[PDB]
Amino acid sequence: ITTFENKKVLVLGLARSGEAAARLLAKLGAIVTVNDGKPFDENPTAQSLLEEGIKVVCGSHPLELLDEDFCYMIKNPGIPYNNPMVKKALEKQIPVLTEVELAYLVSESQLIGITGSNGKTTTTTMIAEVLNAGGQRGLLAGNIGFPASEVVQAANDKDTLVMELSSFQLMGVKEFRPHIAVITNLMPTHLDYHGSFEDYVAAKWNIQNQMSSSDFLVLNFNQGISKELAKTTKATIVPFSTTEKVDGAYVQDKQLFYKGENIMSVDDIGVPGSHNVENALATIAVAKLAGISNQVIRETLSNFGGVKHRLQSLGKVHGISFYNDSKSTNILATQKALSGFDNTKVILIAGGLDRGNEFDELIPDITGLKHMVVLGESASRVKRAAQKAGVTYSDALDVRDAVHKAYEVAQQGDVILLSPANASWDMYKNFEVRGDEFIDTFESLRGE
Ligand SMILES: [Cl-]
């Protein structure tokens, strides 16, 4: 791959994948400039990149930067397209891509891509577990696991990337071509960013733009929209349904089938609810296309217990339950995580990268908490919300320290919950590294 050798490339934003993109581009011989809104002195990632000899521009977005001879922009997916830097790149006919396109260009591995309005993380995780159990080598990538541009460097032609993809990422692909792709479902989501439902659907539909009839697109035939979209792709359609028999994965007589093969019972899926039946059906379609055996599919999905870092129940130490919800990186996710708990039992660990917002929205949901242990760049802002909600709080140096501090104030029947309502990037490369520190500390307290 010489396509980036001695080309100037602008990486707009850091966040989850921008560092990985910048590093991979540099390895490919590109001359990289990173532009990020957070001032340099508060920006550990930009500091580290400058130390590696990559140009950084922090605290501002100068449009004049795009007058330079840039051949590509890699944008943080969540930046909306009405952003002035994005608008100018488009005016200047500089291709605007996301990092998943870059990962695809350098990839020698088989690619399975998963998108959809909801069910993405469970479905992606189930797929990787089933492939691994069947003797393939599935590597989680994209919006779980590790960023795609990080994973592709370790992966080879024997590996399968199992990539969770957002509509935001799919706005920025060109050559990206999965051999198998899944759309779990489509319902109005992220319309703040996309405008209309039609534009949001069009964004995800980019997943199949380069797919041929030799490639496979797994669609949800419970929804009429899927049957309409199916008419417009070149990919071979492999539907799933819980409504009727289809030429793919379906429910029949309380069993899950794939094209007339009986795989497993509905009630034996390891996690409950119809949403999980649909995630298991999508998984069965992908696994059968990849050639995994029925017995391996059944065993794996029967024992599937959930996903790492998402309201992940670890167990107890002296009657105190620990939950790793490191995946919660905003106020809305933490509101949801707290909804299932009696707050009087909960010690919440929260704080992280400071995007500059206060936490007043969290006040009703944190009222009644036993205690809050606060860490990270945004700690003072989180503490102001705790103070207004009448919740006692204390400070911690990092997640390890917060777990120890929480445990020392906990008693039998309490819950220690890491649901930070903030991104991890001031202190940890990604939410997974952050959740692993929580796990490791729990294990140290538990013993073996
Ligand atoms: Cl992350």
418 bridge partner residues: 324, 349
CA 230 to centroid of ligand 1, rounded, Å: 33
CA of 413 to the centre of ligand 1 (A): 31
Domain 7-92 of CATH type 3.40.50.720: yes
SS3 content of the chain, % helix, strand, coil (to 5): 40, 20, 40
Specify binding-site residues: 116-122
* Total H helices, total E strands in the chain: 17, 21
- Nearby residues of 214 by Cβ (< 8 Å), 6 or more positions away: 236
CA of 172 to the centre of ligand 1 (A): 19
CATH match for 311-444 among 3.40.630.30, 3.20.20.10, 3.40.140.10, 3.90.190.20: 3.90.190.20
| CA 251–ligand 1 middle distance (angstroms) | 36
Q: Which DSSP letter does residue 202 get?
A: H
Tokens linked to 299: 């065993």
Helix (H, G, I), strand (E, B) or coil at 219: strand
Query: What residues are designated binding site for ATP?
Result: 116-122
Record the tokens describing residue 152, joined without a space.
């592709």
Beta strands in 122-244 (DSSP E): 138-142, 160-164, 180-183, 216-219, 236-237, 240-241
Please tell me the distance between residue 140's alpha carbon and the centre of ligand 1 in angstroms.
Answer: 14
CA of 95 relative to ligand 1 center, distance in Å: 25
Q: How many CB atoms lie within 10 A of CB 350?
A: 30
Q: What is the resolution of this structure in A?
A: 1.5
DSSP assignment of 53-113 equals: T-EEEES---GGGGGS-EEEEEE-TTS-TTSHHHHHHHHTT--EE-HHHHHHHH--SEEEE
- Strands 96-97 and 110-115, by their bridges, are unpaired
* Ligand 1 geometric centre to CA of 408 (Å): 29
234 three-state secondary structure: coil
Distance CA 242, CA 50 (A): 52
In DSSP terms, which residues pair with 416 in a beta bridge? 322, 347
Enumerate residues 6+ apart whose C-beta is below 8 A from 43.
Answer: 14, 36, 56, 58
Q: At what angle do helices 274-290 and 294-303 cross, to 10 degrees?
A: 150
The residues spanned by each domain of the chain are 7-92, 99-304, 311-444
CA 329 / ligand 1 centre spacing (Å): 8
β pairing state of 31-36 and 8-12: parallel
The fold of the 99-304 domain, in CATH, is UDP-N-acetylmuramoyl-L-alanine:D-glutamate ligase (3.40.1190)
Centre of ligand 1 from the C-alpha of residue 409, in Å: 29
Record the tokens describing residue 160, joined without a space.
């399968």
List CB contacts of 41: < 8 A, sequence separation 6 or more.
none
User: Do 148 and 103 touch, CB atoms closer than 8 A?
Assistant: yes
